[PDB]
Design a binder for this molecule. Structure first.
Ligand code: FES
Ligand SMILES: [Mg+2]
Ligand SMILES: [Mg+2]
Ligand SMILES: [Mg+2]
Lengths: 363, 109, 212, 168, 115
RNA sequence: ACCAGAUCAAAAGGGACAAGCAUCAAGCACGCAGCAAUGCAGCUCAAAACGCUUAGCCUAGCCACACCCCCACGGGAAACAGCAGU
């Protein structure tokens, strides 16, 4: 017949419930504290293979036996046969640049996550007279010292773990193993990134290179963190991004590169960082850094790796005799580094061009 | 009767009893090789529900399709243990037999 | 073999459903009209030629009910098309109304009435159809009885009709084969078939609705 | 030459010879038999020769074997109704066993012919379509009708190329 | 392919080569292509007169009745063919086209005669 | 024309269903009982699991795609794999 409802004591709905959010849900100190103890034996210096503190070791540890451990090797793609040997060599020249071959007696490649080479490292440690005394595990924060320490603790190498003040640190008997504090890295994008952003950026699975053929006057975006502007190139070139598989890579023209950047900062197109304009307001703006590439060494050997700190890098192959001009935009706080290619033959692993898009099918 | 499972009745061999009230039965069907035209024992794994847990590894069992799949894989119930392992009763003479030799002679009674 | 679920597909389905629900257009919007171009502004579609004069000259059911108490509930409403087509009285009793208040003049909405077609009424009041049309008219309170005065004409009609020649031959042959020598002609009953004029009102309850 | 004893067993001509087609009630068949025993020789020969034919004619009827499980050989059929039919085969020849199983569970020639009629119904002569299904693709194949234009050009009167000319 | 809506319809599939029309009376889902899949073929039809001046038509009356019962519709050409056959009443448009042709003939005869 | 069951045929469940590579040998939760808590610790795999590469197919026709992001809210961006045409 008739009924009424009361504009007082109301219960009300909401505007724009945004079920999209619901589905988004659904889907120096070391020098002044620790070096004194260390310089009183063997040192295990862990180096992140992806990120390539070394020159300061003589003061940090002093003149004692040191073994280099290149971590996170499994995440490195196999660009060409013998890449492990090439990496061991590269570490050897790096140490020579910085040290006696402090003396470094062994360079080995390990993957604590996959337990690759840990047993061989244990065998080498136990096989020789030279390795007697205590073991000090030195390295950076992200190097994986925690993972390697846990792996070694869960092994026959140890005779379960104790905590003792050096700062309280973990140890276990072998003489005692010593796990020192990780040396924090300056100018690291991980410092700026949040827990979730860092988790996304850090590759947890084996990296798949992503190649893109670019002509002069174009722009590539590795997330919202890294950008490259390719120009003044006598010929097209190839850029192979080696980074976390879940980091979007976007290609655009130079004109639209900016406008896309402001429009899509954060959000989902550039998944890192996150928080939209709120997060971007605090996020440092991308400062520019100019680069000139050497003569293009063919179309299969990378000429240079442009690394955006720990997020990843891009290997560039220009055409023969071609010299290219580049401008890398990276966050103000962090730094952009041009280095000799860590995987020079990474361009070869690829598929075929898909449509007019610059992308190559990933193999 | 109107069961949604495909094979209504299937005779197989129990090859596992590590599941509560469920027996892992192996069923073998002769299959024609289209080229050689010889028949081969193709085999498939079925899970039979056994409330009494009377299945023993090696038993020959008859499995009846359940009216509906009662689990991700349990689609049959043990209708009858056809040949209790090493406790075979000759269906013809009904007397117990050990391989090809009667335990109780058929002339016993 | 396991499929990768289509989360975005599900979200799109649900979001589109919710958007349609929450922006369901009003009647005053859907069934508007531009008397200059005779185009519905909401969709921009032009009305058919044969409805131009009617749209320009006549009025809508709610456009009339807006000028009556209780929205003229209980009055008899006839359609100009019905009046022109049939000499018999046709109309609705208009038992119930439900206008689209959002309209400025409250000249749109829904209605329910007891149909009287060709002078034969119905057993119940049901939803109107073609409410939004323009061919409606109101029976004045006076003259109502005289207008609705209907003399039931003799309804006797053919009980059956002859079969088509070949079907007749088939049936006869089958009978003779079975031995049923009954020579009575085979006839097809048609009383069972309730022929209705093409313009007879349809069940609005099963009719659809426009969308944006 | 073909491999194995009695290679004839591996030819369609022989496999199709099986005259035993189980009624739809039969679903499983288990053949218990002894690899040794003069009395069980008949069952052995049956398993060696006829079982392939039975399986070929009854693809869905599961068939399983059991060597030296019981002193005497036998067959056992499990029907869709849950009934179990135990057939003794001791001392019987393979042919005798085949005839017995045919009598007790095989469809009769009447039923088989009924199935054949049901099948042939599909192949309606009057229908036209690809040779795979119908006898004639196009009515043009039928004599007296206008022949296909490819083989015999149509008159200029019938070709639309000149109906348009008349239109002009 | 799942079809949104649609219904069975008895119609004609236009086989035959160019300038040589020939029709297969088929019962097919109305949404299916003209010559495409079809539930069942009910007969055939040869528009071109044969050597005897006959437009042969074959109608599987049993199945046609069965499908009409099941609820299949009838395309206008098929309704006209059935009417000619006598299975159905002559189509209203067949009758009216006959009358229009008669009036056309009368007009043309008058015009020719009034020279 | 309504209902009828009939016809047609989705979703869902069961079965079936391409090729090469073992220099792809383990997958890493891939199972079960219980109304549930919860328990059991299992499940597939050298009779080829898992994985990589290639391909539309079993042709009255069938499967899939519809510029891309598998999807398409959204974004990328302005879409002929409809006909003719460049
Ligand atoms: S195939 Fe029949 S006319 Fe050509
Ligand atoms: Mg798409
Ligand atoms: Mg296109
Ligand atoms: Mg085209």
């Amino acid at each position: 017949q008739e009924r009424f409802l009361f504009p007082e004591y109301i219960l009300d709905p909401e505007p724009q419930p945004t079920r999209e959010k619901q589905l988004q849900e659904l889907q120096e100190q070391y020098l002044e504290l620790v070096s004194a103890a260390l310089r009183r034996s063997l040192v295990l210096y862990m180096v992140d293979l992806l990120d390539l503190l070394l020159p300061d070791l003589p003061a940090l540890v002093g003149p004692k036996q040191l073994i280099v451990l290149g971590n996170k090797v499994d995440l490195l793609p196999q660009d060409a046969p013998g890449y492990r040997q090439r990496l061991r060599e590269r570490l050897w020249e790096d140490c020579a640049r910085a040290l006696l071959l402090t003396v470094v007696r062994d360079v080995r490649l390990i993957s604590a996550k996959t337990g690759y080479g840990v047993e061989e490292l244990i065998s080498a440690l136990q096989r020789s007279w030279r390795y007697r005394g205590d073991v000090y595990l030195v390295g950076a924060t992200n190097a994986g010292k925690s993972t390697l320490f846990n792996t070694l603790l869960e092994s026959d190498y140890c005779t379960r773990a104790t905590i003792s003040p050096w700062l309280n640190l973990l140890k276990f008997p072998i003489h005692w193993f010593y796990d020192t504090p990780g040396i924090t890295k300056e100018n690291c994008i991980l410092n700026l990134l949040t827990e979730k952003e860092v988790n996304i950026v850090l590759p947890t699975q084996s990296i798949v290179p992503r190649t893109f053929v670019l002509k002069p006057g174009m722009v590539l975006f590795l997330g919202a963190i890294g950008r490259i502007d390719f120009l003044q190139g006598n010929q097209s070139a190839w850029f192979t991004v080696v980074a976390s598989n879940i980091l979007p890579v976007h290609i655009t023209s130079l004109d639209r590169a900016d406008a896309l950047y402001q429009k899509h900062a954060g959000h989902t197109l550039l998944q890192i960082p996150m928080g939209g304009k709120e997060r971007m307001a605090g996020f440092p703006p991308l400062v520019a850094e100019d680069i000139m590439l050497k003569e293009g060494l063919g179309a299969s050997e990378a000429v240079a790796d442009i690394k955006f700190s720990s997020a990843g890098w891009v290997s560039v192959t220009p055409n023969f005799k071609d010299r290219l001009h580049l401008r890398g935009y990276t966050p103000e706080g962090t730094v952009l580094t041009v280095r000799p290619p860590l995987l020079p033959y990474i361009v070869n692993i690829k598929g075929q061009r898909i449509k007019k898009s610059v992308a190559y099918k990933t193999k | 009767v109107r069961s949604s499972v495909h094979a209504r009745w299937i005779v197989g061999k129990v090859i596992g009893t590590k599941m509560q009230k469920t027996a892992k039965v192996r069923v073998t069907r002769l299959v024609l090789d289209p080229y050689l035209l010889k028949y081969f024992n193709k085999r498939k794994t079925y899970f039979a529900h056994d409330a009494l847990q009377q299945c023993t590894v090696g038993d020959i069992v008859l499995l009846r399709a359940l009216p509906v799949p009662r689990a991700k894989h349990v689609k049959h119930e043990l209708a009858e243990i056809v040949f209790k392992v090493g406790k075979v009763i000759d269906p013809v003479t009904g007397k117990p037999c050990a391989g090809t030799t009667y335990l109780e002679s058929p002339l016993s009674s | 073999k396991k499929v990768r679920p289509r989360l975005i597909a599900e979200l799109a389905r649900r979001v589109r459903a919710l958007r349609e629900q929450l922006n369901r257009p009003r009647d005053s919007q859907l069934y508007a009209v531009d008397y200059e171009t005779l185009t519905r502004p909401f969709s921009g579609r032009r009305l058919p030629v044969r409805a131009w004069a009617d749209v320009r000259r006549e009025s809508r059911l709610l456009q009339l009910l807006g000028r009556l108490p209780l929205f003229g509930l209980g009055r008899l409403v006839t359609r100009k098309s019905w009046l022109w087509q049939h000499d018999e009285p046709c109309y609705w009793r208009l038992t119930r109304v439900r206008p689209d208040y959002t309209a400025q003049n409250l000249d749109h909405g829904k209605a329910w009435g007891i149909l009287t077609f060709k002078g034969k009424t119905e057993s119940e009041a049901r939803e109107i159809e073609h409410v939004m049309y323009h061919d409606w008219r109101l029976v004045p309170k006076h003259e109502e009885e005289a207008f609705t005065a209907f003399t039931p004409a003799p309804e006797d009609s053919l009980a059956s009709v002859p079969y088509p020649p070949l079907l007749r031959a088939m049936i006869i042959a089958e009978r003779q084969k079975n031995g049923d020598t009954s020579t009575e002609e085979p006839m097809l009953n048609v009383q069972r078939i309730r022929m209705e004029p093409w313009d007879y009102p349809a069940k609005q309850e099963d009719k659809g609705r426009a969308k944006g | 030459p073909m491999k194995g004893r009695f290679p004839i067993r591996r030819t369609l001509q022989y496999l199709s010879q099986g005259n035993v087609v189980f009624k739809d009630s039969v679903k499983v068949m288990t053949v218990n038999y002894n690899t040794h025993g003069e009395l069980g020789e008949g069952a052995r020969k049956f398993v060696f020769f006829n079982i392939p034919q039975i399986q070929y004619k009854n693809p869905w009827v599961q068939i399983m074997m059991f060597k030296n499980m019981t002193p005497s050989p036998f067959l056992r059929f499990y029907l869709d109704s849950g009934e179990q039919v135990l057939v003794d085969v001791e001392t019987k020849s393979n042919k005798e066993i085949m005839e017995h199983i045919r009598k007790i569970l095989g469809k009769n020639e009447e039923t088989l012919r009924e199935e054949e009629e049901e099948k042939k119904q599909l192949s309606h002569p009057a229908n036209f379509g690809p040779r795979k299904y119908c006898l004639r693709e196009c009515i043009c194949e039928v004599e007296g009708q206008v022949p296909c234009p490819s083989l015999v050009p149509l008159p200029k009167e019938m070709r639309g190329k000149y109906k348009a000319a008349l239109k002009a | 392919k799942a079809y949104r809506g649609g219904h069975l319809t008895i119609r004609l599939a236009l086989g035959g080569c160019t300038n040589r029309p020939f029709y297969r009376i088929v019962a097919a889902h109305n949404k299916c292509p003209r010559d495409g899949r079809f539930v069942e073929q009910l007969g055939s039809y040869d528009p071109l007169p044969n050597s005897h001046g006959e437009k042969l038509v074959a109608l599987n009356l049993d199945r046609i009745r069965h499908w009409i019962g099941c609820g299949a519709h009838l395309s206008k050409p098929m309704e006209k063919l059935l009417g000619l056959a006598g299975f159905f009443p002559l189509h209203p448009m067949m009758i009216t086209n006959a009358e229009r042709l008669r009036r056309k003939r009368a007009r043309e005869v008058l015009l020719a005669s009034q020279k």
